[PDB]
Design a protein around this ligand. Sequence first.
Ligand SMILES: [K+]
Lengths: 111, 208, 177, 130, 205
Amino acid sequence: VKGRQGERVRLYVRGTVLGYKRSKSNQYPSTSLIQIEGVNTKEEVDWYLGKRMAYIYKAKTKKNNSHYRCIWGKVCRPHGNSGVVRAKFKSNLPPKSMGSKVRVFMYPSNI
Amino acid sequence: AKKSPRNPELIRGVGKLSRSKMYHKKGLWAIKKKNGGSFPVHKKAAAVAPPAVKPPKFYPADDVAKPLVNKHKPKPTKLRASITPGTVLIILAGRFKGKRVVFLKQLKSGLLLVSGPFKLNGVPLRRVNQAYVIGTSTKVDISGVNVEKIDDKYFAKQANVLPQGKKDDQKAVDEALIKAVECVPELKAYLSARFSLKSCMKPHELVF
Amino acid sequence: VTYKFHQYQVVGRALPTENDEHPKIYRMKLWATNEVRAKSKFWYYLRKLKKVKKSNGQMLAINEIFEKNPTKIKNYGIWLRYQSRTGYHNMYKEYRDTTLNGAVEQMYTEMASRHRVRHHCIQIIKTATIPAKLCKRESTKQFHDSKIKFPLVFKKVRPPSRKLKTTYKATRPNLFM
Amino acid sequence: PFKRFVEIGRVALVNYGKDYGKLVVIVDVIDQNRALIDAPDMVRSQINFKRLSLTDIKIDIKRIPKKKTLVAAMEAADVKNKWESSSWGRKLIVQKRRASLNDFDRFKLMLAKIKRAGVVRQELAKLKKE
Amino acid sequence: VSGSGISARRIVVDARHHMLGRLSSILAKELLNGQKVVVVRCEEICLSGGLVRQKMKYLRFLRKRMNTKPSHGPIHFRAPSKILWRTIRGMIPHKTKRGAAALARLKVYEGVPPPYDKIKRMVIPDALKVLRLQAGHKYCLLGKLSSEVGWNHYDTIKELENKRKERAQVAYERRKQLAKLRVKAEKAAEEKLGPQLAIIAPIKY
RNA sequence: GAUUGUGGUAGGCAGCGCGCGCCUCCGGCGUGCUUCGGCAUCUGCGCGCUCCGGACGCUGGCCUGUGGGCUCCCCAUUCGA
Ligand SMILES: [K+]
């Protein structure tokens, strides 16, 4: 009915990069604050604890016949009460990723 | 030879019985009485003399460090309770991501042996890591499926062309699996369809 | 069941001496968030009203008092004296609650709200369970109705929990009484 | 106006907290903010009105009745069946059932819905062309 | 306010009967999080305190001007949409690139201009007057204040909104007729599919 | 769920199983003290096991490549200044 052209199966949820763990006057970019769509309480975060995440972005040059790049991470612990999480990546996320979407996968699975 | 454990474990590393009851059960009193009120002394096992290793061809200028002994030995990988023979699994990664497959058994290495069946969804006999799998509540009878001869060595590389023997074995295995699947209505379509997340579908709320 | 304020009966006396082999034993009914603070206030009152200090005094007993029937509503009267910005005054108040602990918590909250009197500036002189016919305040007497009937004028709209909270809604809330 | 009132015998739904989804009976009123509620499977205790949603059901009881009397009144009024049969009460049950569906059940429901949608679309097209 | 967390191309908000400050805070957070927001019917925004207090506040704002060069600011916009835009800017670090980008993701309109007149419009419960303001307390419409302080497009907006509402009423009547036809079709098709209705029954509301 | 493996000549320390007795083997059979449940009272040797004197194991990708690394250079962004 739609006639769309794209990924046929989605096995991940989206996450918005809010920023870094920080105080009013200090910033710690080693930790990233991520909001996962559909997660509204720290109790709900328990399911995603330890789940792998990928930050996919585009580069000007081609690497292995592709402009796509990926920085992997995972969910570490809940942040606050509203479902935000603290996440760690192999390298600190660039500040320009603020407001961009990361993919939160369903693995490693516990079910 | 005792055919049953003398001291069952209440928890890991703690026995149900104390030292006095263990003394009574083990029969140390009987051994002492038979031997004449004294325990029998057993000579220490004689060590094997080291083999006459030939002299080395080279002598290193530095004394290489020998690592300290590690007393920890790995245990077999655990299988989740939600995964039992005949359980339907959802693959979350790889070229078969989203496919629904039937679980057959766990191999020695800890990986899971699964089948599509191949005809239904194109998934052959394959090994899938437990960490990249979701165990659902759908179970299909697999009593008539014989996979005894298949083990971790069946998938070992010999290092392009699939031998016909593997195809025949997969067909033989899948015949009974499909026969069992046909019993449950709509199970064929369920196994032939992939799992996907639609709008407002929350993984942490789905029961699977 | 957790109460912020607990009722204790504290019993104490002055240390026995040669002159007084069996000194008078004093008891008080006090309100405090803990038994330690109840004992502290007991010694404060004993020092201020009987000349018996904690240093030269003896602690005998302390027991919590629980409402006999926390399943039923009662009318509670509280006689208290408080300190304002310009002096001290006496005050009698009435409350309705299942337990006297809840009534005392209400009393503290209301004193704070209406007179800006902090907790440490309030002394409770007397407490009692008042029958319906003997209540003096119109606020408590208005619910002494066999057929009490009113609509919920003010109801706040919220999801059962934050799990269902959403920033955007397709339609505005539909409210009626 | 004011189709619903808080009353002795009025049945209310707990709309917030750990007790969400439960039916209780208002057996007394403490003050403008909280009342005394009761039900067969709980201990009569106080609750703030902000956590109660009044229903259209009411039972004939006196204030602070006995547990047996309250149960008898609820059974005579058939509170459970009336609430369950009503659309408002059925809504919570349907939400719970939807939450409880499993993957295979969800797939079967999807198949049924697709078939019904196709048949309904054909029927509607025929009606329009008529 | 952590943020909505939704993934959408854009969100259209009907600002009617929304408290100005709370809606502004929620939308500022949404814009900072990377959302694109279109606000319509800004003239229907509600301000607590009443018309008199808000008018005096706006006159106090109008007093502020660079003494030696009034053209250097502050700029006193009169239209409701610009008032909402400035209020939002007040809650955003607009002097940084991040704040400027967040501001650039926001559109504000008076009334409902096209194509947003045929796009679903949502509301913000946390800023709704019905939930935030007790009945009887003083409030004023943003459009009324703007007209009092020098906005001269209120009547045109009213006329255009009346025309749009008439067209929307006609469309709604057509949709209701279509819905009745669809219910008739469903009734006709009921007898065709038994088992499917049986599986669907325990889920229907 | 998260961070982490510092050391590199030790089978130590602590606890416990199997054989040195038998029977009908989810257990039972001997001497003492018991609160009648039980008890470090008899508790020795040989071979083994463990939450036991600081991480080990398996698999995969890649190796002249649009690969990997970078403390170098020019920039952009968040925080600081
Ligand atoms: K670890």
